Structure formats: C-alpha cells, structure tokens
Amino acid sequence: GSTRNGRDSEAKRLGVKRFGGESVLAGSIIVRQRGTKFHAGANVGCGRDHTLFAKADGKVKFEVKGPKNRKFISIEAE
Amino acid sequence: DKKSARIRRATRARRKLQELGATRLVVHRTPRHIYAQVIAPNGSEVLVAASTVEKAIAEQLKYTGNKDAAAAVGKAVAERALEKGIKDVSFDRSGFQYHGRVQALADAAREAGLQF
C-alpha cells in the first residue's frame, strides 16, 4: 500500500545564539524563539517574532527573576 | 479586591518605567489623604516625599481629601525635588485614573516646575 504521512518543514535554527558572559555588539541576536520562553532584561529588546537582541554593547547574562521564576536575559555593560 | 485590582492596573506602567530607567513620581490616593513620592530609577530609594499627613501641609487645609489638598501636595513635592536637582520625572498614576485629585496633584507639580 501507500503512506499518508511523509511531510515535514525545514528546521528554523532557533535557540540561544550568544551564551552567558559572551561579549556582543548592539543589535546582535541572542536567542531566537517561538514565544517568550526567555524574556528581555536590561539593554535587551524583543522582536515581533519574539527574537531577543542586544540594545547595548556588553555581556549576555541569564537570570531567573520575578514572582513567576521566568528566565530573563540582560546585557551587562563592560 | 479594589487594592489588588489597582495594583494590576498599576504594574503595566511601572514595569515600563523600569526599562526606561526613569525617575518616578508615585502618587497614592486614599479617601482621606493624598501622597507623593519621587523615587530613584532603581526603585528602592525615595528622593523626596510630600503628603497631607504632614503637619506642614495639613495645617493649611480644611480637608485633606479634596482637590484643593492635592494641589497642595503636588506643589510641595515639586519644590522639594527642585532644590535637590531632580527637575525631570515621569508621572506614575499608580492605578488611579488621571482625573480629579490625581490630575490636580500633577497639575500643581507641573506648574511648580517638574517636567513631565
């Protein structure tokens, strides 16, 4: 017989691009994600597709914060 | 709860003022008194504070819960900030409507010298 499966989609290469303590330039993507699995901290913005990017030069910093224990990514100035 | 539902109304603007790193003028309103605090951008240190519970302000007021009292607190908190060189804040209505006593307090603070 034949198969009713067989389809898929090309991988989107999501995930963390710069890790903890990495020096980044402004506007450099830190994490590509579906939804805010990570949240924007200081000097960090969020794109329309929920991409997080640096808004200043500095180091990437991950921290759990807030009453919901959500993960935040902030930039620490050099 | 009124107090909880007001905190929910307040936190959307408060988090935004955290990302901007702005000096925050926080107004609190009760049926009997009105309050004002200028808070450092970190959020944990109070620069100046004026309220109707202080004898310096309440003594010259017939009632401390009217709009004429809110203009008294707004004027006093602005002068105290000006002598400490703040002069540039962002108003946090803190969940109340910008209307009546809250508006009257901001209007006094504006014409007295604070830029917001």
């Binding site: 017989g1 034949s2 198969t3 499966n5 | -």
Partner: protein, 136 residues
C-alpha cells in the same frame, strides 16, 4: 484479553527494554509472581497465565494483575517487501524487566499459591520467582 480502551496514538517506536523494574514489592496481596528475566508479555500470555491461576485456586481468594499490555506491536503481512509504510497493529505487549511483580494472590494458603503460580509460570516466556509480602 487486556488492551487499552483508547490510545492517542496507534503505533509506537520499538524502543528498548533496558534497566530494572519499578514495582518490585508485593503491594496488594500476600504472595506474588515476580519476573526474574527480561522480555515481553503478550496479552494472550497474561490471559492464559491468569486462567491457569484462577482455576488452580477455584476462584477462592483474589488475583491482582500488576502488568498491563499497553504497547502495540505491529507486523507486516506475509510476502510483502520493505518499506511502503509501517505495518498494522496485531497485538499488545507489556515490557517486563527483572524484579517486576506480575501477579499477586490473597486469601489462600501459601502452598496453594506456590502451586497456582507454578501453573501460570508455565505459560509465560519469562523466568519467574515466587515472592511474598514483607513488612517493609
């Protein structure tokens, strides 16, 4: 013949059967049939081994079956090649790892369960052992 009444997915990966078992003590009865070896228990075997116990004791006492056949096993028919999709589900098995207690019995003398479990163990493809409840 045990089988899930409904399942979200019809087929399942083969997987592996590593490790030891969870559920090694006698929990509901006083005597148990424990699995010493590793393998699969087919729902027909569980039905056949349960019928041997339940007539050996003549339906006096109570039987607990501790394993359930929830993993579907598919086979391709005869004389078809490879490939052309995954086969059709034909039966269901339970994965059994060493120490797994398969049955429990209560309300019987020990000598009657040791005989009843011996008849059941003749229908199972796994090495088994007779075990009893411990105070802890």
């Amino acid at each position: 013949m045990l089988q899930p009444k409904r399942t979200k997915f019809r087929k399942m990966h083969k997987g592996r059967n590593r490790g030891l078992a969870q559920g090694t003590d006698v929990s509901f009865g006083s005597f148990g049939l424990k699995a010493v070896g590793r393998g699969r228990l087919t729902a027909r075997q569980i039905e056949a081994a349960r019928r041997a116990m339940t007539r050996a004791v003549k339906r006096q006492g109570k039987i607990w079956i501790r394993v359930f056949p929830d993993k579907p096993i598919t086979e391709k028919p005869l004389a078809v090649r490879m490939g052309k999709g995954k086969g059709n589900v034909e039966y269901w098995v339970a994965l059994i790892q060493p120490g797994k207690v398969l049955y429990e019995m209560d309300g019987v003398p020990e000598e009657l369960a040791r005989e009843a479990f011996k008849l059941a163990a003749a229908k199972l493809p796994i090495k088994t052992t007779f075990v009893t409840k411990t105070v802890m």
